[PDB]
Amino acid sequence: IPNIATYTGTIQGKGEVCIIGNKEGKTRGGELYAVLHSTNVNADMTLILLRNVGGNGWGEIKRNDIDKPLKYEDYYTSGLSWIWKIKNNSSETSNYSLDATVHDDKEDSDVLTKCPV
Amino acid sequence: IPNIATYTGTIQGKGEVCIIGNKEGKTRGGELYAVLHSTNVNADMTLILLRNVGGNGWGEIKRNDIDKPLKYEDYYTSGLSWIWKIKNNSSETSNYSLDATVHDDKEDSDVLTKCPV
Amino acid sequence: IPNIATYTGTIQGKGEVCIIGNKEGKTRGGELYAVLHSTNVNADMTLILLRNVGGNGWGEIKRNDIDKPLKYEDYYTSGLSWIWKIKNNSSETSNYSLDATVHDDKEDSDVLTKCPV
């Protein structure tokens, strides 16, 4: 039943971009997968998986550097959401592309205007 | 002081095997240790440690590749079980052996019919 | 704007020392950071981040070797405390220094008399 989509963009120096999954908090267990890439061989980015635990708010599950796939297996309740946080560690603006598990079709609005704070 | 038992078996192509620890729900804490091995040199397996944190469900707490020892510390006052999930990423039916922390003594029934879903 | 303190001490061979943060569980969101160091060039130590889970007890989030920073983002609405556990893997009694995010200022009482059990 797999469904990996690709979000592409540009991330400014020191910027952060958050892309949400299963914002509808619908029923969907099993593997989350994502990998972060850049066309820039000198990119320096970190990918962070956040989950809204069960109600306490958002918390990190794990993180990886660019080109290292991030895999995570979950059966926490009913439904629940995840966010992929991309952090540019460099001062250099660069392309990114993120391949990630999606619950439903990729929408423009999956890219959040603001990460969790 | 570690109590470490070794589970052996055969895992079919693309198959998954879960093994329960502390099924009897005793109160324990301290280091969990496991390491997955295979006699097949082109084996490609993943070991995943799962727990049920409470009013919440089963989820992954960490993972390691074959031959990479998995070490993890917790201390819960209630009697919580853990599950080792062995994933065969290869098509080749392969030997496995799992060295892992056990509470008392290994039993055939520790191999579950179904991983948490 | 981060407040990073440095704890310094000496850790006996095979010893473990735990340092608590945010001990009253005041509400916070953002990154927890710590890195373990030693003036012993040969030091062999592990740093483990533990979180108090839901009153259920303490559980490891992640771990790193000496000299490798540990970062973790939490945006939970209820405050929670954390522990940095320093394990001396060597039999050699060694200096340590831990640079870590603090919420107040560093206090003597942050050095726990005992790690969770």
TrEMBL record, chains A, B, C:
- Disulphide linkage map: 18-115
Which keywords annotate this record?
Signal
Q: Does the keyword Lipid metabolism apply?
A: no
The parts of the chain that form a coiled coil are none
Does the record carry Zinc as a key word? no
Record-given protein name? -derived mitogen
Q: Which organism is it from?
A: Yersinia pseudotuberculosis
Q: Which residues of the full protein are shown?
A: 35 to 151 of 151
